[PDB]
Structures are given as structure tokens and as C-alpha cells.
């Protein structure tokens, strides 16, 4: 239901966004992200129905609203728990049969291991084919990355890299 709108002319307000993006149907929420310095803003426009958002994308994508031409995406959104002072690794190319527990059992014996989460489809409960592992130490996360890079888990090679450094 959420569209990302990019390359927004900085003079464009929420009210101006509403008069264009209403073209798809009733809007539940508009949120413009004002740059506090950049030449353009971006926004999130949320509809009640997926069908409505698609109309707005279809109709308005690549069009001049004022000075800049508008770039619309379906917004990638996630819900993730977090822990302070941790060093997190992305772990991709996960076999669809790999769950948090399988991932845990693959990294737990490495020094400073904290947690592992597979990224789940919010509606279906299917694996997105990637996840994250957390460590309390940067050198130890580095150690786990070097040791598990390309290594096979449930038939598939692990793709690892820093998520936030």
C-alpha cells in the first residue's frame, strides 16, 4: 500500500502531493521527508488498497510535478528488532528452508555471536532468501564473515557482508 516518491522539488508540499496522488484513490497518509540542508525531498504515500497505489504509480511515474520529474517505487519496508553496540552481517542466498534456528546453528559457535534472523515475508511467512547475524565484537564478526563466506548451507553458498559498516 506504500509508494516511495523520489526526486521531489523542495517547494512541493503535502497538499500538492495530495492533489496529484489522489488520482489513484483515497490516501490514508502522506509523509514528506524534508532535507535539512540535498536538492530534492522524498515522500511516502499510503493508500487503503494496493490497487489504488498501482494506479498512482502507473499514472504519475516519470512526470513533472513543478520543476523535477517524479520517481515512484513500491516502498520496501521492514520490521526488525535491534540491539545497541552490535556489529551486524547480512547473510544472503539462504535456502528457502533455512529459518532463524538453522541460521543460528550455523553461526552460534563463533566467538561473540548474539543473534540471527531470517527476513520473512510479512503476509505468507515464506523466507526472503536472506537474513542477518549479530555480533558483540567487530573483529569477531569479521572472523565469522571470512570463515563462512561462500560456504554452503543447505545446498546454497552464503553471501556475507557488513550491514552497517
Note whether 86 and 136 are same-domain residues.
yes
Please identify, among 62, 78, 94, the residue that sits at the C-terminal boundary of a domain: 78
* Burial of 5 from C-beta contacts in 10 A (0-12 / 13-18 / 19+): buried
Question: Using an 8 Å Cβ cutoff, are 30 and 18 in contact?
Answer: yes
Domain of residue 126 covers 79-165
Interatomic CA distance for residues 119 and 104, integer angstroms? 13
Query: Cα–Cα distances in Å, from 74 out to 34, 92, 131, 137, 145?
Result: 20, 22, 21, 35, 31
The method recorded for this entry reads X-ray
- The CATH number of residue 110's host domain is 3.30.70.330
Interatomic CA distance for residues 140 and 148, integer angstroms? 12
Interatomic CA distance for residues 118 and 65, integer angstroms? 39
Interatomic CA distance for residues 9 and 149, integer angstroms? 43
Please identify, among 32, 53, 78, the residue that sits at the C-terminal boundary of a domain: 78
Note whether 55 and 108 are same-domain residues.
no
Amino acid at each position: 500500500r506504500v509508494l516511495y516518491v523520489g526526486n521531489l522539488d523542495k517547494a512541493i508540499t503535502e497538499d500538492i502531493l495530495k492533489q496529484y496522488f489522489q488520482v489513484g484513490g483515497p490516501i490514508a497518509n502522506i509523509k514528506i521527508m524534508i532535507d535539512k540542508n540535498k536538492n530534492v525531498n522524498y515522500a511516502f504515500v499510503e493508500y487503503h488498497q494496493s490497487h489504488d497505489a498501482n494506479i498512482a504509480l502507473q499514472t504519475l511515474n516519470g512526470k513533472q510535478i513543478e520543476n523535477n520529474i517524479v520517481k515512484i517505487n513500491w516502498a520496501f519496508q521492514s520490521q526488525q528488532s535491534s540491539s545497541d553496540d552490535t556489529f551486524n552481517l547480512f547473510v544472503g542466498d539462504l535456502n528457502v528452508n533455512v529459518d532463524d534456528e538453522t541460521l543460528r546453528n550455523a553461526f552460534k559457535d563463533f566467538p561473540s555471536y548474539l543473534s540471527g534472523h531470517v527476513m520473512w515475508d510479512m503476509q505468507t511467512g515464506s523466507s526472503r532468501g536472506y537474513g542477518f547475524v549479530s555480533f558483540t565484537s567487530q573483529d569477531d564478526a569479521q572472523n565469522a564473515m571470512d570463515s563462512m563466506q561462500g560456504q554452503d548451507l543447505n545446498g546454497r553458498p552464503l553471501r556475507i557482508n557488513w550491514a552497517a559498516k
